[PDB]
Every structure is written in structure tokens, then in C-alpha cells.
Amino acid sequence: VWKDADTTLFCASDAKAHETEVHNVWATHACVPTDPNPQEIHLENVTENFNMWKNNMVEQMQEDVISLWDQSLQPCVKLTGGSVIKQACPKISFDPIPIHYCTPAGYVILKCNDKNFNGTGPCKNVSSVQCTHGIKPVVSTQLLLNGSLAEEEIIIRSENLTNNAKTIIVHLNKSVEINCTRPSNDIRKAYCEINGTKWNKVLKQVTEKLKEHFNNKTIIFQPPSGGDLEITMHHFNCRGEFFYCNTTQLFNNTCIGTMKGCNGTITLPCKIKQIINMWQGTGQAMYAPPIDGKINCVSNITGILLTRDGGANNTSNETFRPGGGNIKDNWRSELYKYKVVQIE
Amino acid sequence: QVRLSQSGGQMKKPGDSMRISCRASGYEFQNCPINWIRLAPGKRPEWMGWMKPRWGAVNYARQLQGRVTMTRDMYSETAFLELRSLTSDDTAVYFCTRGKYCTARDYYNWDFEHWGQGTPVTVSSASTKGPSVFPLAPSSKSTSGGTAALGCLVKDYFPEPVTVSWNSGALTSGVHTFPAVLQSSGLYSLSSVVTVPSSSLGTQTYICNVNHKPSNTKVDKKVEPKSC
Amino acid sequence: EIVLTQSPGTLSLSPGETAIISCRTSQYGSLAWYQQRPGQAPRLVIYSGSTRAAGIPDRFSGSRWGPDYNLTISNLESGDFGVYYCQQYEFFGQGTKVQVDIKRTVAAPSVFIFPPSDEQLKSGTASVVCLLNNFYPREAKVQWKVDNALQSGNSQESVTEQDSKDSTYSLSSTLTLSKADYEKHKVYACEVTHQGLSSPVTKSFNRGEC
Numbered sequence: 001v002w003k004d005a006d007t008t009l010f011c012a013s014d015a016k017a018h019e020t021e022v023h024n025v026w027a028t029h030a031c032v033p034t035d036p037n038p039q040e041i042h043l044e045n046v047t048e049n050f051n052m053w054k055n056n057m058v059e060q061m062q063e064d065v066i067s068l069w070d071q072s073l074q075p076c077v078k079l080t081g082g083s084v085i086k087q088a089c090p091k092i093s094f095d096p097i098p099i100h101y102c103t104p105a106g107y108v109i110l111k112c113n114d115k116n117f118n119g120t121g122p123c124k125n126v127s128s129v130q131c132t133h134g135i136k137p138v139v140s141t142q143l144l145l146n147g148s149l150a151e152e153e154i155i156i157r158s159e160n161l162t163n164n165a166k167t168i169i170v171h172l173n174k175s176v177e178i179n180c181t182r183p184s185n186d187i188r189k190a191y192c193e194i195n196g197t198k199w200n201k202v203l204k205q206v207t208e209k210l211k212e213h214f215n216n217k218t219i220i221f222q223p224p225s226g227g228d229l230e231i232t233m234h235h236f237n238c239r240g241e242f243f244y245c246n247t248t249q250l251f252n253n254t255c256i257g258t259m260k261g262c263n264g265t266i267t268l269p270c271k272i273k274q275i276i277n278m279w280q281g282t283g284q285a286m287y288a289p290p291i292d293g294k295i296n297c298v299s300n301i302t303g304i305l306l307t308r309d310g311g312a313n314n315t316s317n318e319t320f321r322p323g324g325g326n327i328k329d330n331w332r333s334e335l336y337k338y339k340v341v342q343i344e
Numbered sequence: 345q346v347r348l349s350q351s352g353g354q355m356k357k358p359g360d361s362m363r364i365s366c367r368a369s370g371y372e373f374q375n376c377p378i379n380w381i382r383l384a385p386g387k388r389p390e391w392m393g394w395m396k397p398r399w400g401a402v403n404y405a406r407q408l409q410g411r412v413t414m415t416r417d418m419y420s421e422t423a424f425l426e427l428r429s430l431t432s433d434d435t436a437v438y439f440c441t442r443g444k445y446c447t448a449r450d451y452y453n454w455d456f457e458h459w460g461q462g463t464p465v466t467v468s469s470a471s472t473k474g475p476s477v478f479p480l481a482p483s484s485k486s487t488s489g490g491t492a493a494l495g496c497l498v499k500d501y502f503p504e505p506v507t508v509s510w511n512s513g514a515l516t517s518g519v520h521t522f523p524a525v526l527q528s529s530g531l532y533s534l535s536s537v538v539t540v541p542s543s544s545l546g547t548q549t550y551i552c553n554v555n556h557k558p559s560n561t562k563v564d565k566k567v568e569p570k571s572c
Numbered sequence: 573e574i575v576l577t578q579s580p581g582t583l584s585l586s587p588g589e590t591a592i593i594s595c596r597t598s599q600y601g602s603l604a605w606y607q608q609r610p611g612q613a614p615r616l617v618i619y620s621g622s623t624r625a626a627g628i629p630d631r632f633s634g635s636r637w638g639p640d641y642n643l644t645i646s647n648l649e650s651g652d653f654g655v656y657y658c659q660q661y662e663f664f665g666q667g668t669k670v671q672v673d674i675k676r677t678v679a680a681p682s683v684f685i686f687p688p689s690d691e692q693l694k695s696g697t698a699s700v701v702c703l704l705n706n707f708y709p710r711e712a713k714v715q716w717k718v719d720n721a722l723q724s725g726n727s728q729e730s731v732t733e734q735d736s737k738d739s740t741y742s743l744s745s746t747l748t749l750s751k752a753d754y755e756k757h758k759v760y761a762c763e764v765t766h767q768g769l770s771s772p773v774t775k776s777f778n779r780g781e782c
């Protein structure tokens with residue numbers, strides 16, 4: 001017999017002790033080496049309830065990533081709480097590695113294996129593991145990058161779809177590469193490339209899936225209504241540099257319905273900023289100009305963060321806008337099938 | 345103790361834009377969404393949108409799209425509301441609100457325990473229009489042995505208010521002056537009535553005195569039985 | 573899109589009595605009740621259907637039957653009167669005004685109808701006025717009939733405050749038509765139903781004839 005519980009997890013990784021890359025260094029001291037032969041026990045005739053939106057594993061990972069970023073991506077100047085902090089800010093080696101989260105003695109992680117599991121409610125096919133899969137602590141807004149894919153159908157995730165204040169996570173079943181590049185020889189200017197044939201077909205499937213959740217209403221996408229640049233644009237870190245990419249073209253209603261002309265390569269305008277709003281929760285940070293040469297990162301778009309327009313209208317359509325900003329949601333998108341329980 | 349304190353009331357014209365502020369205190373400002381709700385008598389409370397201070401993320405009510413803007417200043421813990429292209433329909437008391445449940449890890453937005461004191465905003469034309477005054481005639485035959493009703497219909501004026509007296513205030517008994525109604529035209533209308541002995545209809549003169557200060561209008565109208 | 577239908581529009585009650593306010597929803601979920609006193613910000617009374625907010629006495633209770641949520645306020649005090657709203661997410665009901673009523677014997681209204689004045693008819697519009705004078709209780713229904721056809725959307729009503737002396741109410745109803753529409757019909761009737769009347773009473777006039 002067991003029961004739902006919360007405890008202090010430990011992390012595991014395949015970090016290299018010789019590596020100067022920031023995630024490797026952190027993991028060397030914070031984590032233990034992974035298990036060569038992991039043990040998964042499928043629980044027969046067992047039905048468990050889950051809730052990805054109230055999973056405290058997310059809280060611990062959040063603390064870890066903040067700790068990672070604070071101790072590794074130090075600004076030249078930190079503007080926070082009326083004060084000003086000037087530090088050394090050397091260029092770093094930056095590339096997220098997979099981090100496993102595991103339970104100590106007396107505790108075990110339960111894993112939901114239902115292929116269409118939406119994040120909350122009962123799960124029929126449950127297994128028992130010590131550690132989660134390898135999760136890369138990728139910090140981004142609007143688009144979830146380099147994450148896991150849904151096994152079968154596209155899955156809509158929300159604590160409550162009828163509540164316009166709750167975040168919506170669209171979990172894709174097919175990756176769509178995003179190829180972002182800052183060329184060699186304005187040094188702050190950059191761009192991301194996406195195959196519009198692949199993206200629009202996926203986006204069409206997203207609208208159809210959303211139709212199933214909102215009574216066959218017309219599904220419409222719009223740009224963000226407002227907010228800081230970190231959320232009104234696709235914000236992410238590539239090779240230590242903070243990227244801001246305009247996603248207006250990524251959500252083209254014209255291409256997902258008269259559907260002729262947008263069948264090619266989509267190029268999003270990006271800019272590398274040295275003055276940023278920190279996601280860690282404080283204020284503004286200042287960094288050195290970008291490194292020289294070719295700055296490039298090819299990522300998998302594996303998820304989308306959305307917010308739905310509220311209001312006492314009466315139309316037969318729902319409007320969705322690229323969301324994000326709550327980085328805890330990023331971890332929720334990978335930790336959704338896990339929950340900690342205590343043995344007796 | 346959680347507090348929300350709002351800026352002062354405003355008078356606006358059609359076409360103007362308005363900006364109001366809501367200063368928060370007593371809690372961690374960036375942990376909870378701030379909402380804007382407006383109240384107008386005779387209408388449903390209307391949610392205009394929420395704003396999350398962390399990144400300034402917003403969600404605007406669909407029927408206000410393109411007209412409204414919500415921002416915040418993190419240092420002063422103040423939320424700001426802007427509404428453009430004002431019309432008469434925007435006349436209301438504007439409130440900022442916050443949910444009852446809010447922690448550093450979780451919140452529920454919609455149980456509004458906390459309200460600002462409200463910011464009244466009136467949107468109206470500078471123009472004024474004096475009332476038309478029509479008699480509400482007694483009746484046909486003088487039914488000696490009963491009481492008769494007569495009055496004045498005070499129609500199509502703007503803005504409020506008009507007042508009505510009878511016989512320069514000498515007649516008060518049985519006088520009823522009704523609260524005005526707002527018509528489809530955007531102009532106001534009301535009636536004032538008085539019940540009098542039917543046997544007095546051929547002896548005593550009945551005059552309603554209509555006053556409308558905004559248009560500098562004072563009208564006297566004698567109400568007498570129709571001759572037929 | 574959540575449809576909240578609140579009823580009734582107005583409650584006229586005396587201190588010590590009970591107010592019963594209901595809200596019908598098109599969607600289940602957490603429903604809240606708010607109180608707004610005159611010249612004051614709204615106040616959270618009940619949330620999650622039946623949970624009392626802080627400072628709210630147990631005279632306030634929320635209940636639910638099917639899609640119908642009810643706020644019941646027992647032993648009404650002065651501080652209880654005002655307008656009440658139900659709420660689900662961003663949606664609010666139309667509100668229920670609870671106002672103080674002083675009790676007295678039932679009194680049927682005296683009903684008068686006023687044809688348009690010849691002076692107004694020169695302007696192109698026709699206003700027909702029906703007066704309901706000195707009645708109690710406040711609850712009354714007025715219907716307009718033009719050539720025995722029920723009218724909808726072309727009338728406006730107004731009610732006086734309860735009289736300080738005789739504790740009665742009076743009501744004015746105005747039917748507004750174009751001059752062209754007015755001269756199209758003959759019988760202009762206004763029908764009054766009230767507890768003080770054994771049967772609905774109709775006052776009418778025929779156009780043209782005196």
C-alpha cells in the first residue's frame with residue numbers, strides 16, 4: 001500500500017567531469033551518475049489518478065534550474081530591487097543536458113503510460129520507476145523546444161479549459177525543426193528558419209484537435225496582446241546568447257485553411273539582446289555583446305504554449321495567442337506523467 | 345492586509361481616451377493577476393481583462409479588443425488601465441480586483457475578495473438640449489364626485505436633470521414626478537402627474553413648471569381639459 | 573461562453589424577512605455571490621457555491637439545485653440591502669436589487685391613460701402614457717395592446733420610491749410610436765394586473781373620438 005506524497009528528490013545525469021559546459025558542471029556536483037539498468041514494473045489491475053498541474057516535482061526542478069542559471073549565467077550588471085550589482089561576465093559554454101529526477105528510499109515514482117493521457121484524471125496503465133526520463137531544462141517562451149513528443153494523437157493540456165487564466169499546453173506528436181542562426185559579418189540581428197509545409201500541417205492538426213475541445217467552434221490564432229518582449233516573442237537561449245524571435249508568421253490562419261502560396265520556408269526575424277528581463281523572477285540583466293562567428297541552434301519544436309481570449313462575446317469562434325512566461329509550465333510538460341508516492 | 349487604491353474620477357467626451365491607475369499593497373505584487381471590472385447601473389458587471397504583473401501578460405475581453413490596454417509598473421506596484429475611443433456606453437464605475445486565493449505557488453483568479461474603491465468615469469457630449477413639454481390632459485367630462493389625473497410629459501432633454509413643480513410650488517398634494525428614463529435616441533424623458541378633484545377642473549388653473557439648468561430652460565405649461 | 577440568468581430583478585422586503593436570490597447557469601463551475609451597497613465597492617459574500625467569505629454571518633447561505641444556484645439572506649438587516657450579483661469566471665448575472673419596503677394593507681392602483689397631445693403629434697411622434705397611482709405592494713405588470721395586439725420593445729416604465737406618508741408606489745408606462753404608426757390604429761389600451769385587483773384592469777381610448 002502507498003499514498004501520494006512529496007519529498008526531497010535527487011537528480012541523476014551523464015554529465016562529463018572534463019566538460020566546461022555549464023549544465024555539465026552543475027550536474028557534476030548536484031547529481032549522481034545514472035543507472036545502467038533501470039527497473040520499470042508495470043502495475044496490473046491498478047488505476048491511479050494524476051494531476052500535472054499540482055505536481056510538486058515541478059517545484060523542485062524549478063529551484064534547480066534557477067540555481068543552475070544563477071550560478072552560471074551571471075550578468076555584467078544586475079538591476080534588481082533598486083540596487084545595482086556589477087560582476088564579471090565571461091562568455092560561457094551553454095548546452096542543456098538531460099536531467100533525471102529520482103526518489104530516495106521509502107518513495108517511488110508512479111508513471112502513467114496511457115497513450116492519450118491529457119495530464120489529469122485516472123490512468124489505467126501505470127508503471128513503477130525510480131527515476132524519470134532524461135529531461136533537458138530548456139528555458140523558452142511560446143514554443144517548447146527539444147522536449148518529448150506525445151505517443152499517439154496531439155494532446156491538449158490544461159488545468160481547466162473553461163478558465164481563460166489557465167495556461168494551455170499543446171503537446172505535438174510530430175517534431176518541427178526550428179533552425180535559428182546569427183551569421184558572421186548589425187551583429188545583434190538573427191533569424192530562424194522553419195519549413196512552412198511541415199509546420200502548417202501540424203498547425204492544422206492543432207486547430208482540429210482544439211475543435212474537439214471547443215464544440216467545433218472556428219479556431220483562430222492571433223499575436224500576443226501585450227507584455228514584455230520575453231513573452232510577446234519567442235524567447236530562448238542559444239549558446240549563451242539570449243534570442244528574441246518574432247512569431248507572427250508562425251501562426252498564419254491563411255495557411256491553415258484558401259490554402260495556397262505559403263508552401264515553403266518561413267523566416268522569423270530575431271534579435272540578440274544584451275539587456276533582458278530575467279525569468280528567475282528579479283529585474284533586468286546586462287550581458288556582453290554576442291560571440292563572433294556563426295551562432296546556430298537547431299531545435300525540435302515539440303510543444304506550444306497558448307492563452308485563450310476571454311470575454312462575454314457571442315461569436316462561434318475562439319481566439320488563441322502564443323503564451324508562456326511561467327517556466328514551471330515547461331517542466332510540467334515533461335513531468336506530467338509522473339507522481340511521487342510513499343510506500344506505507 | 346491586501347489593499348487596492350485607485351485614481352480619481354473623470355469626465356470625458358466621446359472620442360477621448362482615458363487612463364486610470366490601481367496601486368496594490370500588502371502582498372507580493374507579481375504573484376497574482378489583476379483584473380478590471382466595470383459597473384454601470386442597469387447593466388451586468390463587465391470583466392474587461394486581466395493583467396499578470398510578472399511579465400505584463402494580458403487577456404482582454406473579446407468585445408473590447410483593440411480598445412483597451414493594461415500595463416503595470418513593478419517598482420510602484422501599480423496597474424494601469426487605458427481605454428480608447430470612448431462613447432456613452434463606456435460610462436461606468438471602473439474597478440480593479442484581485443482573487444482571494446493567491447500564494448507564491450498557486451492562485452485562483454475569479455473569487456474577487458479584493459476591490460479598489462472604484463473610479464467613476466462619465467462620457468458625454470458637451471451639448472445640451474432643452475425639454476419639449478406636452479400636456480397630459482385630464483379627460484373628457486367633469487365627473488363631479490370623483491378625482492381626475494393630469495400632468496406634463498417632459499420629453500427629449502439632455503443631460504439630466506429636470507425638475508418639475510406645479511403652480512409654482514403651491515400645489516404639492518398628490519403630485520408624482522417620476523424618475524427619468526433614457527430613450528433609444530440618447531435623450532431623456534419623464535412625466536409629472538397630479539391628482540385633483542374633478543370639480544376643480546373648470547375653476548382652478550393647473551400649470552407645471554419645468555426647469556432644466558444645463559440648457560438654461562424654464563418652461564411653464566398650462567394643462568387644461570381638451571375641448572370637444 | 574457562460575450564460576448567467578439571475579432572478580428576480582428586484583426584491584422589495586422589510587427588515588427581518590428573508591431574501592431569496594437565484595442564478596441559473598448554462599455551465600457548472602465555481603459560482604460566487606457579491607453584494608454592492610450604495611456608493612460602495614462590491615463585496616464577496618459567497619464563493620464556490622456555498623462557502624462564506626470572511627466577515628459574512630451565517631444568515632447568508634448558498635445552495636444549488638441542478639443548474640440553479642440560490643443565495644438566501646435570512647433576517648434582513650439594514651446593511652444587507654443593495655444589489656447582489658452572481659458570478660462564474662469572467663461572467664456576471666444581471667443583478668438583483670434588494671430594497672427596503674415598509675409594510676401596509678393591499679391597495680389597488682387607480683389607472684389612467686393619456687392619449688398623445690395634438691402638440692406632440694405635430695412633431696411626428698406619439699407618446700401614450702399609462703399611470704398606475706398609489707398602489708401596494710410594488711409588484712405590478714403593465715401590458716400595452718394596440719388593436720388587441722400585444723406590444724413589445726416600444727414602451728418604457730418608471731416607478732416612484734415608496735411614499736413616506738401612505739407607503740404606496742406609483743408607476744408610469746410610456747408607449748412611443750411614430751405619428752404614422754399611431755394613425756394606423758384605433759384602439760390603444762393598457763392593461764394592469766395587480767394583487768389589489770380581482771381581475772386585470774384595462775384602460776383604453778379610441779383615436780380621434782373624444
Ligand SMILES: *[C@@H]1O[C@H](CO)[C@@H](O)[C@H](O)[C@H]1NC(C)=O
Pocket residue numbers: 042113114125127
Ligand atoms: C503499458 O505501458 C507500457 C509502457 O509505456 C507500454 O509499453 C504497454 O504497451 C502498455 N500496455 C497497455 C495495455 O496499455
Ligand SMILES: *[C@@H]1O[C@H](CO)[C@@H](O)[C@H](O)[C@H]1NC(C)=O
Pocket residue numbers: 118119120121122156157158161
Ligand atoms: C482530461 O481527462 C479528464 C478525465 O476524463 C477530464 O475530466 C478532463 O476534462 C480532461 N481535460 C482536458 C483538457 O481534456
Ligand SMILES: *[C@@H]1O[C@H](CO)[C@@H](O)[C@H](O)[C@H]1NC(C)=O
Pocket residue numbers: 151152153154155173174205209
Ligand atoms: C498526430 O495526431 C493527429 C490527431 O491529433 C493525427 O491525425 C496524426 O496522424 C498524428 N500524427 C502522427 C501519429 O504521426
Ligand SMILES: *[C@@H]1O[C@H](CO)[C@@H](O)[C@H](O)[C@H]1NC(C)=O
Pocket residue numbers: 146147175300
Ligand atoms: C528531434 O526530433 C528527432 C525526430 O523527431 C529526434 O530523432 C531527435 O533526437 C530530436 N532531438 C533531440 C531530442 O534533441
Ligand SMILES: *[C@@H]1O[C@H](CO)[C@@H](O)[C@H](O)[C@H]1NC(C)=O
Pocket residue numbers: 179180181193298
Ligand atoms: C540552418 O540554416 C543555416 C543558414 O540558413 C544553414 O546553413 C544550415 O544548413 C541550416 N541547418 C540545417 C540543419 O538545416
Ligand SMILES: *[C@@H]1O[C@H](CO)[C@@H](O)[C@H](O)[C@H]1NC(C)=O
Pocket residue numbers: 195196197198264265
Ligand atoms: C518541407 O518538408 C517537406 C516534407 O514535409 C519536403 O518535401 C519539402 O522539400 C520541404 N521544403 C523545403 C523548402 O525544404
Ligand SMILES: *[C@@H]1O[C@H](CO)[C@@H](O)[C@H](O)[C@H]1NC(C)=O
Pocket residue numbers: 232233246247248
Ligand atoms: C512582428 O512582426 C510583425 C511583422 O508584420 C509586426 O507587425 C509586429 O509588430 C512584430 N511584433 C513585435 C512584438 O515586434
Ligand SMILES: *[C@@H]1O[C@H](CO)[C@@H](O)[C@H](O)[C@H]1NC(C)=O
Pocket residue numbers: 248249252253254255260261262263
Ligand atoms: C500568410 O500567408 C500568406 C500567403 O502565403 C501571406 O500573404 C501572408 O503575408 C502570411 N501572413 C503573415 C506573414 O503574417
Ligand SMILES: *[C@@H]1O[C@H](CO)[C@@H](O)[C@H](O)[C@H]1NC(C)=O
Pocket residue numbers: 095096138145146236237238239296297298299300
Ligand atoms: C536542442 O538540442 C540540440 C542538440 O540536440 C542543440 O544543438 C540545440 O541548441 C538545442 N536547442 C536549445 C534551444 O537548447
Ligand SMILES: *[C@@H]1O[C@H](CO)[C@@H](O)[C@H](O)[C@H]1NC(C)=O
Pocket residue numbers: 120159160601602
Ligand atoms: C475546473 O474548475 C472547477 C471549478 O471551476 C473544478 O471543480 C474542477 O475540479 C476543475 N478541474 C480540474 C481538472 O482541476
